[PDB]
């Protein structure tokens, strides 16, 4: 055990850094916070329908293997995180 929980793989690390995350190991809480921040400041969510994230053409969409996803049905987000966070 240690204080940090996960090490993101490179494309996810880039996303987290783009949102203002510092360093390269994190708690899962930090990963979720900065991923949300990224989506917020890249404005990938639909202004009208804000559960919908349009990530096609973004590195996040590359990672998800998807043009969009819903935060109300976040299972592909968790799929991606399971694949792109390496446990410490």
């Amino acid at each position: 055990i240690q204080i940090n929980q996960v090490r993101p793989k490179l494309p996810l690390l880039k996303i987290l850094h783009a949102a203002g995350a510092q360093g390269e190991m994190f708690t899962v809480k930090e990963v979720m916070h900065y991923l949300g921040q990224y989506i917020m400041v890249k404005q990938l969510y639909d202004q009208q329908e804000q559960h919908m994230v349009y990530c096609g053409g973004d590195l996040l969409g590359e990672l998800l293997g998807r043009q969009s996803f819903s935060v109300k049905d976040p299972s592909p987000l968790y799929d991606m995180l399971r694949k792109n966070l390496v446990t410490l």
């Binding site: 899962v28 809480k29 979720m32 949300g36 989506i39 917020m40 969510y45 804000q50 559960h51 935060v71 109300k72 976040p74 987000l77």
Partner: peptide, 12 residues
């Protein structure tokens, strides 16, 4: 709803 409000509801 608000993106940040929905996002905050997500579990670990």
């Amino acid at each position: 709803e608000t993106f940040s409000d929905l996002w905050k509801l997500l579990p670990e």
